[PDB]
Structure 1
């Protein structure tokens, strides 16, 4: 699991796919994430509907992987519905700066909600943030996040973590097929990236960045080629 976000280094993002056989798709796959999201190339699909979530507050652990901080839910944290297929919410990864761009703009943080169906299909819902008012979700975790920095520990019980504190506006999003954004960069992942940009405070991002290894202080994978794949867009009109 040594990989780095330092461009130019032997273990850096351009080389991920040559580091070990298990990571080859990082270099050779053609539906890699993240990508550029461009309004002028989207296919509109009114048929997708408002994003259908039913999430539940539940017991969680915070983990420092060394290259990101994530929330790891212990109980059943509820689920996301796409095409009446149901995907359970398992984890939330944090990346600063953002990995996705929207019309050429890179944001200050991205949160990625990883879900898994019983069929084991994967869907990720991404939220993009600009510096502003604190994020209510991270507020309730700040003192736990701090402990990665004021101590030796790399897991922490965060108790009950509520995903309905997340800044998700269900009325508009992008949708496309992609990959995990870190090794093993596996494909077949449905991505939903929320149009509405949330806010997070600088203090909150700093806490996150304090937590990780040095080679991961910025932990965004560079944008990958779109390669002609389709990008769908839904947006609910006032009518």
Structure 2
């Protein structure tokens, strides 16, 4: 039926409705750290999030997402491997049922407990709908989560999750500052890829940060209490909403760091 992460509608099925699932530049991938190429022509990332305006938090039945006002250049990503200015639209997470799985990207086959995606779109295309049709339309910042110490800047998000437990619930979520989710270092790997959910469009420049952030077990536990289902349907916990690594095919992963 409609796609998801279950036995009968999960990632191994998606190609029937979205044939680009078997394409040449699909995501995520395993990052082989010994095969990644240091590229000294890569610039530092510029993350300018001081003027970010968050709007809403929403359970969309496959993750939860925080949406931002992208009507002007408030929260932007520039530099790195990018040409031009990319506006922050939303962030969302992927996570597991257990601490040893949950990330989409892996590093030398290592899985992390979760993965944070900050999705940005190239302002030269005027709106995000147009941007997803272009090979350089989106830039997604990927950040790994490991279980350890708590991340204080994540707590405002975990404390509102009980109010968006089921599919289609949303809530006002203003004045959230996404800088509190970033690691110390902005060293990164980058490669051309795709959205990791349908429609799996091959429009993404991936920027995956080397340094994970730490979250506590109590914080990740709250993610795992969300539901895939709508209110009044049989309860199905929202866990393991990650798509496995795809073949690299004819691509090179570049590193910003030696």
d(CA) in 1 for partners of 2:68, 2:240: 24
Per the alignment, in what secondary structure is the counterpart of residue 249 of structure 2?
Answer: coil
d(CA) in 1 for partners of 2:201, 2:64: 20
Per the alignment, in what secondary structure is the counterpart of residue 76 of structure 2?
Answer: strand
Question: Which residue does 1:62 correspond to in 2?
Answer: 57
Deviation for aligned residue 1:122 = 0.5
Structure 1 position 114 matched with structure 2 position 119 = yes
Runs of 4+ in structure 1 deviating by more than 6 angstroms, as ranges, are: none
Structure 1 position 231 matched with structure 2 position 247 = no
Deviation for aligned residue 1:70 = 1.1
- Contact kept, 8 Å, 1:148 with 1:154, in 2: the verdict is yes
> By percentage of residues, which structure has more strand?
1
Deviation for aligned residue 1:232 = 0.4
Per the alignment, in what secondary structure is the counterpart of residue 193 of structure 1?
Answer: strand
Cα deviations by residue, 1:66-89 (Å, 9 ceiling, x for unpaired): 110111113655100034511001
d(CA) in 1 for partners of 2:238, 2:9: 12
d(CA) in 1 for partners of 2:186, 2:64: 28
d(CA) in 2 for partners of 1:136, 1:153: 27
Question: Which residue does 1:80 correspond to in 2?
Answer: 77
Cα deviations by residue, 1:117-160 (Å, 9 ceiling, x for unpaired): 112310000000110112233212222112123x7861111111
TM-score normalized by structure 2? 0.83
Question: Which residue does 2:195 correspond to in 1?
Answer: 180
- Contact kept, 8 Å, 1:61 with 1:74, in 2: the verdict is no
Deviation for aligned residue 1:115 = 0.1
The match for 2:176 among 145, 161, 171 is 161
Per the alignment, in what secondary structure is the counterpart of residue 106 of structure 1?
Answer: coil
- Contact kept, 8 Å, 1:68 with 1:212, in 2: the verdict is no
Question: Which residue does 1:3 correspond to in 2?
Answer: 3
Which runs of 5 or more residues in structure 1 are unaligned? none
Which runs of 5 or more residues in structure 2 are unaligned? 96-101, 126-130, 132-136, 229-235
Aligned ranges for residues 1-239 of structure 1 at < 5 Å?
2-6=2-6, 9-18=7-16, 20=17, 23-26=18-21, 28-55=22-49, 56-74=51-69, 77-82=74-79, 83-96=82-95, 97-118=102-123, 119=125, 120=131, 121-149=137-165, 154-213=169-228, 214=236, 216-235=238-257
More divergent stretch after superposition (75-84 vs 52-61) = 75-84
TM-score normalized by structure 1? 0.89
